[PDB]
Every structure is written in structure tokens, then in C-alpha cells.
Paper text:
Here, we identified that trehalose monomycolate (TMM), an abundant mycobacterial adjuvant, activated human T cells bearing a unique αβ T cell receptor (αβ[name]). This recognition was restricted by CD1b, a monomorphic antigen-presenting molecule conserved in primates but not mice. A cryo-electron microscopy study of CD1b-TMM-[name] complexes revealed unique antigen recognition by conserved features of TCRs, positively charged CDR3α, and long CDR3β regions.
A striking characteristic of Y-50 [name]α is the presence of 4 positively charged arginine residues (R107, R108, R113, and R114) within the CDR3α region. Compared with the average CDR3β (14.4 residues), the Y-50 CDR3β was much longer and encoded by 20 residues. The cationic and long loop motifs suggested a [name] binding mechanism controlled by electrostatic interactions and a flexible [name] surface. To gain structural insight into the Y-50 [name], a soluble [name]αβ was constructed for crystallization. Three CDR3α arginine residues that were found to be critical for TMM recognition were facing toward the [name]β, whereas R108, which was dispensable, was oriented away from the [name]α-β interface. The electron density of the [name]αβ was clear except for the CDR3β loop region, implying that the extra-long CDR3β loop may be highly flexible, as hypothesized. The positions of backbone Cα atoms in both structures largely overlapped; however, the location of the long CDR3β region was noticeably shifted upon TMM-CD1b contact. Whereas the CDR3β loop hung “downward” in the structure without antigen, it was “drawn up” like a curtain to allow the recognition of TMM presented by CD1b, providing detailed insight into how the long CDR3β creates the flexible [name] interface with the CD1b-TMM complex by avoiding steric hindrance.
Residue numbers in the entry:
A (entry chain A): 1 to 30, 36 to 59, 62 to 68, 74 to 110, 112 to 217
B (entry chain B): 2 to 29, 37 to 58, 63 to 72, 74 to 81, 83 to 111, 111A, 111B, 112C, ...
């Protein structure tokens, strides 16, 4: 039988840097092939690279290369010169070469490419509903790509993930994340109160 | 040079009969069905070699696959169960004859059928949309304005959000949550929320003849279905929220 292991569930790379996604495998059959596929938010499975078990020519295809070490049973993916479109779920996969060639898939590793924040201005702004003026949301924006945004321990406060925004008109990029909640105690000052925020973060 | 699959979304109950279609025109003679549950890897269901079933990974009988032509693999569905909710992925690859060449018979995948199967159709709700205007503080400090659109209360969680400015869909300066977010994370049948951001210059938001619309295409019941409530039947629909740029 065939087994795929992807230890890392999630990775980060800065834009234009290279990253390595890890994969090891087990197989009884001595003739096999290793695949990487990418799954964007859209949901399609895109072929990236292939390495047959007897190649002895480490595989390369565009910005993708494959650290294939049979003795260690490792088939890591190296992605060069990371682009913001590279963010997706990356799947390690394997088939026997001898039968119907059905793929077995690893658990997958999510990759999030981060922009190099030209000039940080960490702020938390408050945004008003265009219909009823009382309801609102809180927007944490413009911070450095290091900062992690954490879910609220509370389950009635909804906190978004990091989102990367590119205004090609401005040649400008920014991170943001959104927080909202219907409890009467919820405001922008406490919205991200259990995420590690830069001290100079602006709260107008 | 691609695999097509229809429908792209499907909501069924435990009585409906439906069929997924898979089509390719590369000449491939190996065709495959895989099932991908949420946060899980895709798992083989069926393999077809030269239009004849080669592999059946103990797939229960209520899945009834079929290959009418070399270019076309169907999957017929009836009497499904809620655990059948998944992304059904079609693939295809070259298959050369015996003693023929041994190439990289790479599998190419369709975009997949997103399938939700409900115990009861009561569970399906359409999104509510709202749009939130950029703050004076942000405009004054960045000379930029970030609108936020927020879709809430919907189920199943497959919606398609886009921003329309002065009638024409925009893509630049947009950020949409890659994945929705559970509103009652402790419940089996949680309803969902999704947020998007559109960022523009301060002048553009301050131009009061500029229109901003956030559009949410929801995938729910079709017309053949049978609604049993005074609530409105949640058909595949578009729900929208709008805002005018203001002088502040
Ligand atoms: C693939 O890369 C590894 C480095 O991790 C190297 O040791 C190995 O020799 C390469 N494979 C081949 C066939 O050269
Ligand atoms: C696949 O296998 C299951 C279990 O053996 C069987 O019940 C089912 O009818 C089979 N399906 C087909 C299409 O052969």
C-alpha cells in the first residue's frame, strides 16, 4: 500500500523568496511516481511536477523543483521566487506505475504568500453600515506581514483571517483582517484583544 | 485541453435524483472519480479503462457511474446521505496499449462538483449582505478608503462574491476571505459568513456620483424542489448591498 505524509499543515513565505514544502512517503512497490498538485480557493487540482522513482534526475519544472531522496523517502517541493498567486493547498501524491495509476494524496499543506509591506501604518478603523447607522465592523489594516491575527477565544466574535490586498493602480499592497460581533460589549479597542498587535497601532 | 464538470454546485436532499457529468476531449482513455471531504485529501472512488469499470473502491451502490462515450463519464446519484457531502473530482489521463510506450500518464482534474446533501431542506438559508463605509480616520491618514462587504447567515457555504463599481465588475484592490467562517462553530449544521474588502483612493470614495455594489451569488435549491415554509424558498439567487460614495 502507499502512504503519504506531509508533516507541516501550514507555511509562510515572503514574496519573492523560495519555500520548501515537506513530503515523505512509503510504498511496497519499488516502481512508483511522486506528484505535487496545487488547490487554489477556486477548488481545481492543478498539476505542478512529477518524479518517477527511477529517474535519478532530480525533477524541475518552471519555478518548481523536487528534492527527491529515495533513501530518505523524501520528495519535498521547492518553489522558487514566490508570487502572491502561489497561495493554495499543496498536495503530495503518489501512484504505483504498474496498474491503473490511481493517485493517493497526502493530507496537504496550506501555503500563504506574504507581501513585503513597504511602509507599515498599523491601524484599527471602524466602518459604518450604509443602511442602519448603528451596526459596524472593525478593520485592522496596513500592518507588517509578520503579525499573526488570531481567532477570538470567544465564539460570538467573528475574526477573519489575514487577507492580502493589491491595488495595482497604486503599486501598493496591504494586509487586513475584519472583526465583528453582535454583543453590546464589542468595540474596536477590544476586537483583536487576544492577538499580538504592534504597540503603536493607531485607534482613532 | 481541460476537463469540464457540471453542475459546479449542487444541493440535494435524501430523496432527489441527480447526475454529475464529466467531459474531456484530449483522447484520454483512463477516467477517474475522486471524492474530497472537507479538510481531507481526495480519495479514489472509481477508475475506468477504455470505458469499462476497472476499479471500484467499495463505493456504495447509490453511486452509479457510467461511461457512454470515451469522452464522457457520468455519476448518477439517488438516495444520498448527509455524509456524501464533498467535492467530487473528475480526472483523466493517457492510457497506452500493452507493449506501447510508458509515459508520464499525468492525471488532469476537472474543477469538481461541490455537493451538499441535507437531512432536511429546512437547513438552507440565503445570505444577508451589508456594506460598510470607509472611516474618515483612514482617509485622513492613508489617503485611501477601504469598503468592507459582509455576507452573513447562509447555508450551504458556497457563495460567490464580487464588487461592482459604476455598473462594471472590478477586480483590482479586492480581497475576499479564501474560506467562509462558521457562525455557530459548535453546531453540526452551522450557518456561515464571508467578508470582502475593496480599497480605492480617497478621491474616488469622495466622488458622490460613484456607486459601490457588493454582489453575493448563492447556490441553493433549484426550481424542481418542494418548499414547505412561509419563509421564501431559497433558490439559487443573487443578494446585494450597495453604498454611495460621500463627500466625507
Ligand atoms: C534531488 O535533490 C536532493 C537534495 O535534497 C539531492 O540529494 C538528490 O541527489 C537530487 N536527486 C537527483 C536524482 O539528483
Ligand atoms: C462497488 O462495490 C460495492 C461494494 O462491493 C457494490 O455494492 C457496488 O454496487 C459496486 N458498484 C459498481 C458500480 O460496481
Amino acid at each position: 500500500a502507499q502512504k503519504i505524509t506531509q508533516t507541516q499543515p501550514g507555511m509562510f513565505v515572503q514574496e519573492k523568496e523560495a519555500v520548501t514544502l515537506d513530503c515523505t512517503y512509503d510504498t511496497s512497490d519499488q516502481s512508483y511516481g511522486l506528484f505535487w498538485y496545487k488547490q487554489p480557493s477556486s477548488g481545481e487540482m492543478i498539476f505542478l511536477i512529477y518524479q518517477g522513482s527511477y529517474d535519478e534526475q532530480n525533477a524541475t519544472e518552471g519555478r518548481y523543483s523536487l528534492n527527491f531522496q529515495k533513501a530518505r523517502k523524501s520528495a519535498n517541493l521547492v518553489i522558487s521566487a514566490s508570487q502572491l498567486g502561489d497561495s493554495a493547498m499543496y498536495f503530495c501524491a503518489m501512484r504505483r506505475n504498474t496498474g491503473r495509476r490511481a493517485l493517493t494524496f497526502g493530507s496537504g499543506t496550506r501555503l500563504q504568500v506574504q507581501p513585503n509591506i513597504q511602509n507599515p501604518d498599523p491601524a484599527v478603523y471602524q466602518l459604518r453600515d450604509s443602511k442602519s447607522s448603528d451596526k459596524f465592523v472593525c478593520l485592522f489594516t496596513d500592518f507588517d506581514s509578520q503579525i499573526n491575527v488570531s481567532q477570538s477565544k470567544d465564539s460570538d466574535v467573528y475574526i477573519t483571517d489575514k487577507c492580502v490586498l493589491d491595488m495595482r493602480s497604486m503599486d501598493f499592497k496591504s494586509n487586513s483582517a475584519v472583526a465583528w460581533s453582535n454583543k453590546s460589549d464589542f468595540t474596536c479597542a477590544n476586537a483583536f484583544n487576544n492577538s499580538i498587535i504592534p504597540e503603536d497601532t493607531f485607534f482613532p | 485541453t481541460e476537463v469540464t464538470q457540471t453542475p459546479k454546485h449542487l444541493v440535494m436532499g435524501m430523496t432527489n435524483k441527480k447526475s454529475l457529468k464529466c467531459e474531456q476531449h484530449m483522447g484520454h482513455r483512463a477516467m477517474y472519480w475522486y471524492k474530497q471531504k472537507a479538510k481531507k485529501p481526495p480519495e479514489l472512488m472509481f477508475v475506468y479503462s477504455y470505458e469499462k469499470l476497472s476499479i471500484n473502491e467499495s463505493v456504495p451502490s447509490r453511486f452509479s457511474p457510467e461511461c457512454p462515450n470515451s469522452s464522457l463519464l457520468n455519476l448518477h446519484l439517488h438516495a444520498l446521505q448527509p455524509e456524501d457531502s464533498a467535492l467530487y473530482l473528475c480526472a483523466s489521463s493517457h492510457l497506452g496499449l500493452a507493449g506501447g510506450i510508458d509515459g508520464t500518464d499525468t492525471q488532469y482534474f476537472g474543477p469538481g462538483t461541490r455537493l451538499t446533501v441535507l437531512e432536511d431542506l429546512k437547513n438552507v438559508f440565503p445570505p444577508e449582505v451589508a456594506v460598510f463605509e470607509p472611516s474618515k480616520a483612514e482617509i485622513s491618514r492613508t489617503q485611501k478608503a477601504t469598503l468592507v462587504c459582509l455576507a452573513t447567515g447562509f447555508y450551504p457555504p458556497h457563495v460567490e462574491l464580487s464588487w461592482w463599481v459604476n455598473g462594471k465588475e472590478v477586480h483590482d484592490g479586492v480581497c475576499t476571505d479564501p474560506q467562509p467562517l462558521k457562525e455557530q462553530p459548535a453546531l453540526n449544521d452551522s450557518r456561515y459568513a464571508l467578508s470582502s474588502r475593496l480599497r480605492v483612493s480617497a478621491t474616488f470614495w469622495q466622488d458622490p456620483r460613484n456607486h459601490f455594489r457588493c454582489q453575493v451569488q448563492f447556490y441553493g435549491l433549484s426550481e424542481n424542489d418542494e418548499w414547505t415554509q412561509d419563509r421564501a424558498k431559497p433558490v439559487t439567487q443573487i443578494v446585494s448591498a450597495e453604498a454611495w460614495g460621500r463627500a466625507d
